Amino acid sequence: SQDSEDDSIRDDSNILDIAHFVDLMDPYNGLLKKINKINENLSNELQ
Amino acid sequence: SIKEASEDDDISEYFATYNGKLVVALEEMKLLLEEAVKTFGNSPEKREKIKKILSELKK
Amino acid sequence: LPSLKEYTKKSKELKETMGQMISDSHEEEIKEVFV
Amino acid sequence: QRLQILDDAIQEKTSELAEFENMVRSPSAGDNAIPGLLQIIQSYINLLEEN
Amino acid sequence: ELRLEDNYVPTSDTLVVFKQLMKLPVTVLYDLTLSWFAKFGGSFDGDIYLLTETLDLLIEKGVRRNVIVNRILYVYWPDGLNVFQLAEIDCHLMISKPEKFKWLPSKALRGDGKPYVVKLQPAKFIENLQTDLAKIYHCHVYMFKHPSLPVLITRIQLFDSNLDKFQGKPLISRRPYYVAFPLNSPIIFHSVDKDIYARLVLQSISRTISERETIIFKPVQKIPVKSIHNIMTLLGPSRFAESMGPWECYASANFERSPLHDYKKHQGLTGKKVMVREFDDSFLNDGKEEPEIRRLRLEKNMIKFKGSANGVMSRYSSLVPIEKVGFTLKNEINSRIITIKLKFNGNDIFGGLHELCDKNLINIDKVPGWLAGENGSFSGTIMNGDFQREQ
Amino acid sequence: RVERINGLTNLQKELVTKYDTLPLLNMNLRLSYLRDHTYPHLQVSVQSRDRVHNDGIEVLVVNYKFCRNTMNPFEIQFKMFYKFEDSTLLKWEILRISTNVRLKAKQLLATRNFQKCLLSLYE
Numbered sequence: 001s002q003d004s005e006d007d008s009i010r011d012d013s014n015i016l017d018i019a020h021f022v023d024l025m026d027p028y029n030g031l032l033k034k035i036n037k038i039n040e041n042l043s044n045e046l047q
Numbered sequence: 048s049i050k051e052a053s054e055d056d057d058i059s060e061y062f063a064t065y066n067g068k069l070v071v072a073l074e075e076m077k078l079l080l081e082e083a084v085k086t087f088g089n090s091p092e093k094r095e096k097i098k099k100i101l102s103e104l105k106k
Numbered sequence: 107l108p109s110l111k112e113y114t115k116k117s118k119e120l121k122e123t124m125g126q127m128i129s130d131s132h133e134e135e136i137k138e139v140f141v
Numbered sequence: 142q143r144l145q146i147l148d149d150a151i152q153e154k155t156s157e158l159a160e161f162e163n164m165v166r167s168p169s170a171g172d173n174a175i176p177g178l179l180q181i182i183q184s185y186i187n188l189l190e191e192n
Numbered sequence: 193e194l195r196l197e198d199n200y201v202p203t204s205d206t207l208v209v210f211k212q213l214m215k216l217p218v219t220v221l222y223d224l225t226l227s228w229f230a231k232f233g234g235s236f237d238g239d240i241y242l243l244t245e246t247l248d249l250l251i252e253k254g255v256r257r258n259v260i261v262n263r264i265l266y267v268y269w270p271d272g273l274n275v276f277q278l279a280e281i282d283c284h285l286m287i288s289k290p291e292k293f294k295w296l297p298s299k300a301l302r303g304d305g306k307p308y309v310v311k312l313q314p315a316k317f318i319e320n321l322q323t324d325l326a327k328i329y330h331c332h333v334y335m336f337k338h339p340s341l342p343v344l345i346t347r348i349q350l351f352d353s354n355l356d357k358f359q360g361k362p363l364i365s366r367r368p369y370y371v372a373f374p375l376n377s378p379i380i381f382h383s384v385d386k387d388i389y390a391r392l393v394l395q396s397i398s399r400t401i402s403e404r405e406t407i408i409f410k411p412v413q414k415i416p417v418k419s420i421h422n423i424m425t426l427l428g429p430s431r432f433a434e435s436m437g438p439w440e441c442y443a444s445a446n447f448e449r450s451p452l453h454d455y456k457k458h459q460g461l462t463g464k465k466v467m468v469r470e471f472d473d474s475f476l477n478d479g480k481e482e483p484e485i486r487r488l489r490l491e492k493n494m495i496k497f498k499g500s501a502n503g504v505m506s507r508y509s510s511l512v513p514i515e516k517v518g519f520t521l522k523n524e525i526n527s528r529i530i531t532i533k534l535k536f537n538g539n540d541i542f543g544g545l546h547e548l549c550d551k552n553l554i555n556i557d558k559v560p561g562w563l564a565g566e567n568g569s570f571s572g573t574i575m576n577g578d579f580q581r582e583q
Numbered sequence: 584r585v586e587r588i589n590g591l592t593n594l595q596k597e598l599v600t601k602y603d604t605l606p607l608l609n610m611n612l613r614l615s616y617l618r619d620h621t622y623p624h625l626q627v628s629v630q631s632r633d634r635v636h637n638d639g640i641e642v643l644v645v646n647y648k649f650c651r652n653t654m655n656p657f658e659i660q661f662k663m664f665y666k667f668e669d670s671t672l673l674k675w676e677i678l679r680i681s682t683n684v685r686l687k688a689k690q691l692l693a694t695r696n697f698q699k700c701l702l703s704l705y706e
Contacts (some may be wrong), residue, residue: 067166073175073179077185080182091191096189
C-alpha cells in the first residue's frame with residue numbers, strides 16, 4: 001500500500017552500511033589507527 | 048588496501064585479529080592514560096593531553 | 107529479474123554480519139566519551 | 142535478452158558480494174571486555190580532566 | 193519510380209559538356225574514364241585492362257586533353273553522358289576550382305532552440321533524400337567527401353517537364369543545388385539560390401535529416417562568401433570560428449605552450465618588445481621616423497588586424513578574405529541614439545583597412561574590434577559596445 | 584619610445600604599452616588570479632625543481648594542501664618527471680598522501696591521467 005517496505009526493489013541503506021563499515025576498519029585512518037595515533041601522542045606528551 | 052597493508056594477506060584473519068588488536072589497544076591506552084594522570088596531574092600537561100586526545104579522536 | 111531477491115537475501119546476510127561486527131567493535135560507545 | 146545479460150551481471154556481482162561475506166564472517170563475543178575497558182578509561186579520563 | 197537512377201541519360205548539349213571537360217586536367221580525366229568504364233561501361237569495345245592499357249598509351253604519348261575529350265564524348269559515350277558522369281565532372285570542377293563557388297551558411301536549429309549537431313549516415317541519407325524528393329520532382333543526388341576538408345558535399349539536380357517543336361523526348365536539367373555537410377557542426381553550407389526549387393531542396397533536406405525531432409534551418413548570413421575552405425574557417429567547426437581578427441592568436445595558440453614545457457622559454461621570462469602608445473590625441477597633428485620603431489608600429493597594426501606579430505602565414509592578405517560587411521554603430525550621446533552605417537566593399541575588407549592603417553590614414557589606437565576583423569564576415573549593429581549580428 | 588616588458592612589469596606600465604590581445608604578463612597578478620579566483624582554499628607549494636640536464640628531464644615535487652576544511656585538511660605530494668622539450672610526462676608517482684583521504688585517493692590514484700586525479704581531489 002502506502003506505508004510498507006518488504007521488497008528491496010530500491011534500497012540504499014546497504015551502501016550506507018558498507019561505507020560506514022569500510023570507514024570503520026580502514027587500515028590507514030580507521031578506528032584502530034586513530035587509537036594508535038592517540039597512543040603515540042600520549043607517549044610523546046608523557047615520555 | 049588490507050592486502051597491500053598486510054603482506055601476509057590471510058584477509059579473513061584480519062578481522063578476528065582486528066578485534067583482538069582493538070582490545071589490546073584500548074587496554075594499552077588505558078595504561079598510558081593512567082600513567083600520564085599519575086605521573087604529572089598538572090594544569091598545562093592535562094589540558095594538552097585532553098586537547099590532543101580530542102583532536103585525534105574527533106578528527 | 108530473479109537475481110534481485112538473491113541480492114536481497116545476500117545483502118541482508120552481509121548487513122547482519124557487518125552490524126554484529128560493528129556492535130562488537132563498540133565504536134559508538136568510544137566515540138561519545140572521546141568528545 | 143537485454144534483461145538476461147543485465148541479470149547475469151547482477152548475479153555475478155551478488156557472487157562477488159557473497160564471496161566477500163564469507164570472507165568477513167568472524168565469530169566472536171569479546172564486546173563485553175572492550176566495553177568495560179572503554180568505560181574504565183572514560184571514567185579515568187573524566188577524573189583526570191576534572192583536575 | 194520518379195526517382196532518377198544512375199543509368200538514365202538526359203539531353204545535354206554536347207558543346208557545353210565539351211567546354212566543361214576542357215578545364216579538367218588529364219589525370220582526373222584518366223581516373224574518371226577508368227572508374228566510369230569499371231562501373232557503367234561504354235560504347236567502346238574492350239577489356240577493362242585493355243582500356244587501361246589504351247589510356248596508358250595515351251598518357252605516355254603525351255597527347256593533349258582535347259583529343260581524349262573528343263574520344264570520351266564521341267566514341268566512348270556518343271549517345272550522351274549519364275547523370276552520374278554529369279554530376280561527377282561538375283563535382284571535380286568544384287574540387288579543382290573552389291574559388292568559383294559561393295556558399296550560404298544556415299544553422300540547424302531544433303526544438304527548444306539549441307543547435308543540432310548534424311550527423312549523416314551517407315548512403316541512407318542519400319536514399320532517404322532521393323525518395324523524399326522523388327515525390328515532387330525528378331531528382332538525382334550525388335554525394336562525395338572532400339579530399340582535403342572534413343565535409344560531405346552533396347549535389348542535387350532537378351529535372352523539369354518539356355511554331356512546332358518537332359520531337360526531343362527530353363528531360364531538361366536545371367542548375368544543380370549544392371549543400372555542404374560538415375562532419376560535426378550545426379552550420380550547413382548551401383549554394384546561393386532563392387528560387388522555389390532551392391527552398392524545396394532545403395526543406396526536403398531538413399525533413400530527411402531529422403527523423404527524431406523537427407529541424408528548421410535558420411540562415412545566419414545573407415551575404416555569400418566564396419571558397420568553401422574559407423567558409424569552414426569562418427562558420428565551420430574550427431577554432432577560428434568566434435576568434436577572428438585580433439583574437440586569432442587564441443585560435444592558433446602560438447603565444448602559450450604546454451605547462452609541461454621549458455620555463456626558461458616562457459613569455460614572462462624572456463619578455464616581449466612593445467612601444468608606449470600615446471593616449472593623448474597626437475595622430476591628427478602629424479616624417480622619416482626611425483626604422484626600428486617603424487617596424488614596431490607596422491607590427492602593432494599587424495597584431496591588431498591579424499592577431500599575430502608575424503601573421504598567419506602579400507602580407508595584407510588575411511586568413512579569410514571578406515567581400516561585403518556592413519556595420520551600424522549606435523551610441524547614446526546625451527539621451528540621443530546616434531546611428532552610423534558603415535558599409536564596405538572589396539576583395540578583402542580587413543586587409544584593405546590594414547593597408548590604410550599602415551599608411552597612417554586610420555588611427556590604429558582607435559580602430560575598434562569589429563572594424564579590425566573581430567567576428568569577421570558578420571554584419572550587425574553595435575549597441576552598448578556589444579556586436580549583435582543581423583538576421 | 585620602445586619599452587621591454589617582462590613578468591615583473593608593473594600593472595600600470597603594462598597598461599601603458601598594451602595594444603595586443605595576449606594575456607597580461609604581470610606574474611603576481613596571474614598568480615593572484617590563480618590563487619584567489621579559479622582555485623581558492625588550496626595552498627599549493629613547490630619545494631624542489633631539480634633537473635638531470637644530461638637526460639634533459641626535470642624532477643618536480645609539489646604539495647597540494649586542500650585547506651577548505653581548515654580543521655582537518657587533507658594534503659597530497661606528487662613527483663613529476665618532465666621531458667623539458669617535446670613535453671611528455673614519462674612518469675609520475677605519488678610520494679605521500681594524508682591518512683584521512685588515503686583510501687578514497689588510493690582508489691582514485693590507481694588509474695592514470697593525474698590531471699583527472701587533481702581535479703577530482705579538488706572537486
